[PDB]
Amino acid sequence: SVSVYSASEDKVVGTCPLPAVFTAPIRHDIVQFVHTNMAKNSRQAYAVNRLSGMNHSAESWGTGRAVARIPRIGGGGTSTSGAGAFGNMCRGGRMFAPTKIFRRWHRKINLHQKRFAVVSALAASSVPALVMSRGHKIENVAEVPLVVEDAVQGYEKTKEAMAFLKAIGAVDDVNRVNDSREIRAGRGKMRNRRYVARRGPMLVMPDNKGTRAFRNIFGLDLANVNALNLLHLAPGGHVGRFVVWTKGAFEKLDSIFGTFTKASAVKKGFMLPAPMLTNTDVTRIMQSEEVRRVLKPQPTNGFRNRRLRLRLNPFQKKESAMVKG
Amino acid sequence: GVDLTGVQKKKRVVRHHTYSTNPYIKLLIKLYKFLAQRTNSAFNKLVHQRLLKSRSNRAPISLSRIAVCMKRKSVWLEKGKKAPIAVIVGDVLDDVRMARIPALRVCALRFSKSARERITGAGGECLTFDQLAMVAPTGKNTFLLRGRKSGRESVKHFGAAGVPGSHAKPFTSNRGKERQRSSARRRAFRHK
Amino acid sequence: YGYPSLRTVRMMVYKRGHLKINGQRVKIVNNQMIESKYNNENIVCAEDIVNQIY
Amino acid sequence: NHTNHNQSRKNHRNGIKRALPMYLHNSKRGSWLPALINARRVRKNNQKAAVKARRERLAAHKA
Amino acid sequence: STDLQWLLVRQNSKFLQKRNGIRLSSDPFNNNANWTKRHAGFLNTKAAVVKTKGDRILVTTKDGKAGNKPKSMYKKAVMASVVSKAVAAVRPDLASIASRRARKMASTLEHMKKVRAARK
Amino acid sequence: VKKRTKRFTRHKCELFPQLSSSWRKPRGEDSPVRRRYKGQKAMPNKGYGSDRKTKYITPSGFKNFPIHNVQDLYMLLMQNRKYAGVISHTVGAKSRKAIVRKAHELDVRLING
Amino acid sequence: PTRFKKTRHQRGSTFCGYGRVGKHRKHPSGRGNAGGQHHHRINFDKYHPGYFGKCGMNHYHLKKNPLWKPTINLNNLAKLIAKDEALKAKKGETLPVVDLLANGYSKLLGNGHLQTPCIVKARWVSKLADKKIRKAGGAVVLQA
RNA sequence: GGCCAGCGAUCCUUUGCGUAUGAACAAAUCAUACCAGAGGUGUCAGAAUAAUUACCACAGGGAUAACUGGCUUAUCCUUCGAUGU
RNA sequence: AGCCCUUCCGAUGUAGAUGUGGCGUGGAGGUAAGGACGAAGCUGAUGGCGUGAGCCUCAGAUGGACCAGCCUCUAGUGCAGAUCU
RNA sequence: CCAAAGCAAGGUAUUAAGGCACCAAGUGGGCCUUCUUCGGUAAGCGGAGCAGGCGAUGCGGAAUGAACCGCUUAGGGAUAUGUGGC
RNA sequence: GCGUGAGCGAAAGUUUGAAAAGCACUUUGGAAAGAGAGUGACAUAGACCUGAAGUCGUGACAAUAAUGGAAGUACCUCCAUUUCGCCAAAACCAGCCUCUACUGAGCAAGAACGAGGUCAUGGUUUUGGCGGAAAUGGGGUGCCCCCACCCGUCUUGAAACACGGACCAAGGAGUCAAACAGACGCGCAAGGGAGAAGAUAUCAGUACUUCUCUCGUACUGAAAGGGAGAUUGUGGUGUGCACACUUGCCCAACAC
Ligand SMILES: [Mg+2]
Ligand SMILES: [Mg+2]
Ligand SMILES: [Mg+2]
Ligand SMILES: [Mg+2]
Ligand SMILES: [Mg+2]
Ligand SMILES: [Mg+2]
Ligand SMILES: [Mg+2]
Ligand SMILES: [Mg+2]
Ligand SMILES: [Mg+2]
Ligand SMILES: [Mg+2]
Ligand SMILES: [Mg+2]
Ligand SMILES: [Mg+2]
Ligand SMILES: [Mg+2]
């Protein structure tokens, strides 16, 4: 079970059972495979112009002219005359394999793996070691998962919300973000990516009506239970994000993803995947008494060295005594 | 300064680590690697190596084919001997062709939602390798099985078709394209 | 090649003698080493070896 | 040019594989047929008594 | 379980510090900063640390009983085999190191009083 | 005590100013160096691997470990006889004042303090 | 992923696995399937034996919709019958009824050992299916 | 069949043979199909193929002539991104 | 930078195949961090580390503002030779 | 099958891990030599058989040598050699 | 700019600095310029960010085909580390190595005693030497002795009297798509998957779904057409992990 800490203060307003989703398998490889392919759909076509580098009249001067047979720009009166052209090697010439608008830019992911992943990344956020492992400052957090009173979405003013974030202890991971903000390294900064900052807590609203105060409140991403995004559940493709569930968003989290034993009410015949291991700590088995019971419980030269030979051939001294005379 | 002639040809190619990215296989290899080393049992040595195989070489088994191979095994068992656990290092798949199956106690990496429900509709347990290790740390009356792979459609393509002995399946999007008059064909049969 | 003297046999088996053990090339050092290799009530000593190969 | 040099070397790399054991691809087929057909009549009867034998062993094993 | 978690955070985490190919843990709760499952106490159901606390040795502890309530999952206790006696109270295997850190925490504290005083 | 103390330089780096001294494996049938004639330069190989328990160990006897800030020093608090912090080149002389009077207080070694 | 191509491995090895001799050209043989009857003759005959020729009657303007007769075996009628509905089906009692057009099947081939009766309802049936289906106490009822 | 050499794909034509198709239906015609032969590819595992170029050209080749050294008494080893008869 | 230790056998290599918690580059999702007490870049009897690709540090009596690490993603990604441009 | 129930057929020395599959490359100018030859007046010539080599490979030696001799090769030291020497 | 023309067609970042504050004035010069001075945080920021290589000038220095390898040594080291430990030498133990019998004086012949060597063998210190410097290591330059044919290339064969090769910088070459295949990873599995599209919530993404379609579960025949269980269950048999029991069942798998 999980206590529902009030937005107003430290005191819990009650407990709710964990939805089965948090018990679901954590499979980082699928969150990574789904994240990897899923991140490509945001992605956008680039290509060189169809006819760049090739926009010249050019002919090789042939052989017999003490010059490479690369095509040469013709005419005269210019710097580019006689200049090599078209080949990938030349100035002003064509790129090797010119980029096309019909690269496979986007990906298919099976609807089930996309779901296996949102499951595994929520289950990965229920685990405080994974969640503090990925970067979040969760040390003030009352509990994980951090479900929270439903009226936290009733806030209008942003600093009503800022008061809320300090209450649940989330502000240390929001300070993590405001401080993490700086000009991007490298080219990305002249490409409308000038500012990068770290992912912070992801508040998860029961429905669309909650947002307002939590907009603008930087380093606090908002999420909707009815459209959880694996790009947000596992930033970097690493499971374990910090999520502040609202009580309303949380109680309907098995209505959405379903049980191991009961189908999702929204995702058709989807049902949480069965663990491959009923007892996922192998080390506890190995150390178990049922398993412990079955467990399975200097001389070189031997001819001339005296002690070695006397060891290989115990009788040798009885034999050496025979040698005297 | 050594004859080595024929030594390299005797080198064997074996998997020594799983290529599986799946965390649970790795906790499962973590177990049976241990259990295979720390026990004298040959069952742990098989579950451990099969567990290292390709999903290609871990072929799925029909629950139909477990019920067959199991009763065929258990029918001879002297009275008061409960039937062996039906371990497989692979998925277990439901079979529509066998509606009613015995209360089997299958143990496998993975079960179809159909296999798991039919398996429990018969009252049989659908246990994992975790409690397989906890109930049969040694392969004590486990009945390790493999799913089939000869009927796999990839191997229907092995060899040439045009070669006389062969009944290889030619690669063709077009079934009617390489169809041929009975006269022109390779001889079907041929002695090796 | 030729016909080794008993002494030639001693020197090779004691000095240069190496058992195959688990495919390992193992320098003879113990008679324990030899009885384990040769599970043979006949072959226990390094003297058992020199008699056999002589 | 037709030199057969390096061929027995290249052939004994993977050995001369020795021929298949007699117990394997021992198909008849093109065997003198009349014998071959009588053999089917016996083998089919071996099958009915093999199965009939196992039916016996089980009934015997219900005891 | 921890067997699973460690196999998740093992290739990357905030705490792994794979610098120059060397691998140390930035983990607050690891005792010798060795990126190992035995030590990755942020991950373990139970954990023990023997950090300094202003001249005093501090021995943060994490019995599993708190479970997943990070605000109170860790319980400090200020305080030489006695500190090891406390750490073994939660993690018996950590104790041999928890003693040796608990010493080295002392020599550090003695060494710096000599250094901080000498900085005058 | 190292196998080889010399760099394995690229063949004929000395004649061509543009060529970096950094190693490239020679190719070409006729390369004197890959045909490994005796008077030629050597090529790197597994056999020049350093002894494996003295490997990575700087003459100070420490394995260097990168350090960027004062918190990193505690990554070396308990293994201060094995690792020696080498402060990153780009930490400010500002911050290095802080790393250094703290790397002193902790008994951790620093390569560039 | 460009990272993984062996293009990237053999950066430095001058001929990218094409050989110093016998150089990597262009079309050392023809484009596509050129010489299927010449210099690639040994190849198609070994692997694509029926590839050359003509075999049968033409069917100008084939219409596959009229030809659409997908099949379900007796051995697979549990796929259609509800497991709950199928629970008790004595041959002399009430039976699950299984329209096959609904389920997308047209003929009913009489493959394996059906043993649970059903009133299969399908456009076509095998000689052996209607027989097996009756012997199980069920009944195909013809539909269209 | 006359021991052992005496012979040949695909497409096409053609002949035979015992039903099948010409797909809204039906019969006849026609055509097609299956099936088994035949017509032939002698460059014989099978394009249907005349010269010339000193006005010539290109990609190469020392895989290959003359030439150039060598060997021998013709070879083709060097050289055809040129070693002047 | 292999969990530790022990023992044993092997080690050449063109074409080629494969491996690599292998190197390195531009970019991206992450994480972590650095910078006007001086980022990148560049210079270097600056040493140190690595078999090596290389990394790191030192010093600039260089620079003037950005940016390394790590895991994942990506590619217009590594050059003495093309009579290469 | 036999005239037949007997015949036929199927059934109650040293050493060394064996076999099988899949996918795929390069290659498809070879050269020399050993011995055996064939052709040629002869060749550092054309052609084969055998095996070994060079190619792809150094190292040591024959003063020198692609293929001779010895030996074949991780980074090093001692020892002792091989062909060859003093 | 080029071409009669049709047409071809460049290079060029004014990116000094925060600002021009863009060097007034003195001084030499005919001038260009120079020397001062001045501005600015910086003018080796001066009409110009950075400021590489290569090339050149200069100073100082080591020196006497090239390069190169190996190893030393001479000198120098704005380098590293260490010491207030480093170089040595001797010993001890271990290891290791070296240095009768028969026969009719000989061998085809066996040990022993004794002694030596050695740490580029292991363990035991001892004793001395050195200690703003020492010391080990690296780096640099020279030498010495020694080794060492220009690389890339096609080729049986390259040092070739075979081709390409003056220097450096930037660039430069297995790419993208698609259709198959094998392998490997993942998902579900007798099913799998969607696509187009839609509907929604909030942003070309994520979430959601109908209906279908598609590959598959059935094959075969030219085709009309037909279409596979055994005697509540492996079709049999042979060989066949594991487990069971002291032979059974055999999984897969091959074969028949
Ligand atoms: Mg361009
Ligand atoms: Mg231009
Ligand atoms: Mg099949
Ligand atoms: Mg040829
Ligand atoms: Mg190569
Ligand atoms: Mg290739
Ligand atoms: Mg070429
Ligand atoms: Mg080719
Ligand atoms: Mg060729
Ligand atoms: Mg057709
Ligand atoms: Mg021909
Ligand atoms: Mg020639
Ligand atoms: Mg090799």
Ligand SMILES: [Mg+2]
């Ligand atoms: Mg780019």
Ligand SMILES: [Mg+2]
């Ligand atoms: Mg220099």
Ligand SMILES: [Mg+2]
């Ligand atoms: Mg490129």
Ligand SMILES: [Mg+2]
């Ligand atoms: Mg010589």
Ligand SMILES: [Mg+2]
């Ligand atoms: Mg400038």
Ligand SMILES: [Mg+2]
């Ligand atoms: Mg030639």
Ligand SMILES: [Mg+2]
């Ligand atoms: Mg099929």
